[PDB]
Amino acid sequence: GETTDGVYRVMTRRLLGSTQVGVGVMQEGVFHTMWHVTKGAALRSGEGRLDPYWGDVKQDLVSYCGPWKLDAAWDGLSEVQLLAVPPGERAKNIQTLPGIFKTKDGDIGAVALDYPAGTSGSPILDKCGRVIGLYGNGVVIKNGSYVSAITQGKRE
Amino acid sequence: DMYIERAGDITWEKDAEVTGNSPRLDVALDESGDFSLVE
Ligand SMILES: CN(C[C@H]1CCOC1)c1ncncc1Cl
């Protein structure tokens, strides 16, 4: 099926109509998404089939066809772009300066942008176009707004 | 069955809509992958 690098929608026909459950990044022949989007299920790409290769519920990440390839990191200073792919809407780039998730195991970048649940897996990029992480796992703060982590895997 | 459809290239867009704030939050991550606020 389609193996070209880029951002893709993750769809399902198991519910009413065709519903977008998330988004992912195709890079170096490997499809990258969040675990809560697919629950580790196989994916279809036209006639082809993509099988899970690696995944971790705690990191909330999964790769298909090969190991996790994305290793760019947020520099902790510069603005980034969420390449948001919302359900039924065209892909749009939104620039923001990320905040911080201070955890007991170190700090993580965080983007304060609220999009529908089906936007999960949309990549966050640096000025070079490199994927520094995926959008879709985070928290809801006091006022009801959503703040996602800049979730990045490890490249072996 | 789930399927993928191409949505575009991954490129930085100069003159993109600049929005969102930068909050500093004390958070906790559980074994099920869920983030929570620590107070
Ligand atoms: C609407 N939500 C929150 C979900 C998570 C569980 O309660 C509702 C999002 N989920 C993923 N990506 C972006 C958003 Cl804003």
Enumerate the residues of chain B whose CB falls inside 8 A of the CB of residue A105: 29
Shortest CA distance to A120 belongs to which of A17, A26, A32, A3?
A: A32
Enumerate the residues of chain A whose CB falls inside 8 A of the CB of residue B29: 58, 103, 105
Helix (H, G, I), strand (E, B) or coil at A149: strand
Instruction: Report how this structure was experimentally obtained.
Output: X-ray
Shortest CA distance to A70 belongs to which of A79, A62, A80?
A: A62
Helix (H, G, I), strand (E, B) or coil at A140: strand
Q: How far apart are alpha carbons B2 and A156 in whole angstroms? A: 27
Helix (H, G, I), strand (E, B) or coil at A118: helix
Report the separation in Å between the CA atom of A119 and the middle of ligand 1, taken as the mean of its atom positions: 9
Fold of A6-64: Thrombin, subunit H (2.40.10)
| CATH 2.40.10.10 placement within chain A | 80-149
Alpha carbon A134 to chain centroid, angstroms: 3
Q: Which long-range contacts (CB under 8 A, 24 or more apart) does A41-48 make?
A: A41/B2, A42/B1, A42/B2, A43/A10, A43/B2, A43/B3, A43/B4, A44/A1, A44/B1, A44/B2, A44/B3, A44/B4, A45/A1, A45/A2, A45/A3, A45/B3, A45/B4, A46/A1, A46/A2, A47/A1, A48/A1
Cβ atoms of A55 and B14 closer than 8 Å: no
Helix (H, G, I), strand (E, B) or coil at A28: coil
Alpha carbon A82 to chain centroid, angstroms: 10
Cβ atoms of A137 and A148 closer than 8 Å: yes
> Is the Cα torsion angle B31, A39, A6, B19 positive or negative in sign?
negative
Strands (E) in B1-39, as ranges, are 2-8, 17-18, 24-29, 35-37
Mutate to test the pocket of ligand 1, among A89, A115, A124, A134 (most ligand atoms within 8 A of CB): A115
Q: How far apart are alpha carbons A131 and A124 in whole angstroms? A: 6
Consecutive H or E run containing A37: helix A35-38
Distances (CA, A) of A2 to A31, A37, A44, A90, B4: 11, 20, 10, 19, 9
Cβ atoms of A28 and A9 closer than 8 Å: no
Fold of A80-149: Thrombin, subunit H (2.40.10)
Closest partner residue to A129 (CB to CB) among B3, B10, B17 is B10
CB within 8 A of A76, min separation 6: which ones? A109
Cβ atoms of A6 and B8 closer than 8 Å: yes
| CATH 2.40.10.120 placement within chain A | 6-64
Report the chain A residue with the minimal C-alpha distance to residue B13.
A93
Distances (CA, A) of A102 to A109, B32, B37: 9, 19, 10
